[PDB]
Design a protein around this ligand. Structure first.
Ligand code: 4E1
Length: 347
């Protein structure tokens, strides 16, 4: 007996297709689940349109976090009433059978579905550019002083197409977002997309979303995650394979530095000592992004050899942008405004 029979044993509402709510919403089916709860497809009788309804778990901690989501969505939606800045539209919310429900505009496939449809061969560099420009514009929007919003969980699954045959996108899931003042969490971001500062337990700001974006864009074009760690130690090591040891000025201020690294008497840092002649990672900085992207070898896995819009010059620009997004130092990591001016975006 959970919530008088309406809930399962993980605080979720037991969805029933064909159910009608408040003489208004006709529940078609379940679209998906997340840590927050569920999302369903529904027809709104009153407005004569399909909508997506996020059903938050019936548990205080989740309800309370979703209240923050609502505040942030409404705040974004009123600075962006023209819907031109790439953020999902929250139409309204309501409580129902002890669940907070958020009603959103209907959207199409997310970018992971999109990758999956190519069998993980990746999408064209032209399409990757289109997503990147939109995403940087969205981050510019979030960075406006009145908002100062950190999404905190960018990943391909949270970027959706508006229409299945078009390149327009919206960002969803501000369920762990916060504003630059009011930061309340420590372990955040999905692991593959998690920034060094968060891994290191350091204070974080809007620049963590740019880190994530850097990872996403590479994955969109290569078809696989750039840094696919199975836990925090693995994750940090995979980053180090590509970018080398993080600078001393950061590790010196990092509460969790010694979870991954050790400081030599001479004042420099290294990876923690490994056992016994075991070898698991490439040496620091030797896994070059140059090769991962196949800059001079026909793109990822050679698969773009002799296609248009995949020149060496194109790839070099793309690579420069990504490396600026993956700067270890959040003070110098490229910011949305300057990213939008990068040569990768030239008309
Ligand atoms: O955070 C969300 O709002 C969200 N989370 C999801 C989580 C898992 C699977 C699907 C999800 C999902 N589909 C959506 C559609 I279609 C339109 C608007 C929002 C969403 C959404």
């Amino acid at each position: 007996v959970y919530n008088d029979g309406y809930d399962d044993d993980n605080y979720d509402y037991i969805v029933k297709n064909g159910e009608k709510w408040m003489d208004r919403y006709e529940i078609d089916s379940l679209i998906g689940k997340g840590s927050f709860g569920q999302v369903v497809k529904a027809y709104d009788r009153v407005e004569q349109e399909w909508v997506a309804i996020k059903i938050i778990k019936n548990k205080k901690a989740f309800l309370n976090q979703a209240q923050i989501e609502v505040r942030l969505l409404e705040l974004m939606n009123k600075h962006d009433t023209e819907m031109k800045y790439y953020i999902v539209h929250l139409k309204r919310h309501f409580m129902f059978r002890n669940h907070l429900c958020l009603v959103f505009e209907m959207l199409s496939y997310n970018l992971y579905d999109l990758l999956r449809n190519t069998n993980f061969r990746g999408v064209s560099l032209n399409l990757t550019r289109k997503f990147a420009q939109q995403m940087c514009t969205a981050l510019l929007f979030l960075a406006t002083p009145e908002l100062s919003i950190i999404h905190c969980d960018l990943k391909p699954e949270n970027i959706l197409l508006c229409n299945p045959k078009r390149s327009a996108i919206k960002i969803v899931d501000f369920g762990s977002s916060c504003q630059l003042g009011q930061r309340i969490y420590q372990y955040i971001q999905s692991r593959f997309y998690r920034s060094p500062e968060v891994l290191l337990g350091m204070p974080y700001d809007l620049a963590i979303d740019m880190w994530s974006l850097g990872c996403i864009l590479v994955e969109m074009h290569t078809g696989e995650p750039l840094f696919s760690g199975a836990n925090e130690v693995d994750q940090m090591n995979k980053i180090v394979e590509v970018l080398g040891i993080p600078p001393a000025h950061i590790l010196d201020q990092a509460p969790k530095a010694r979870k991954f690294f050790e400081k030599l008497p001479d004042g420099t840092w290294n990876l923690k000592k490994t056992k016994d002649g075991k070898r698991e990672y490439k040496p620091p900085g030797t896994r070059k992004l140059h090769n991962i992207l196949g800059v001079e070898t026909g793109g990822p896995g050679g698969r773009r050899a002799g296609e248009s819009g995949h020149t060496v010059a194109d790839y070099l620009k793309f690579k420069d942008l990504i490396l600026r997004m993956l700067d270890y130092d959040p003070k110098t990591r490229i910011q949305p405004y300057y990213a939008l001016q990068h040569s990768f975006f030239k008309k």
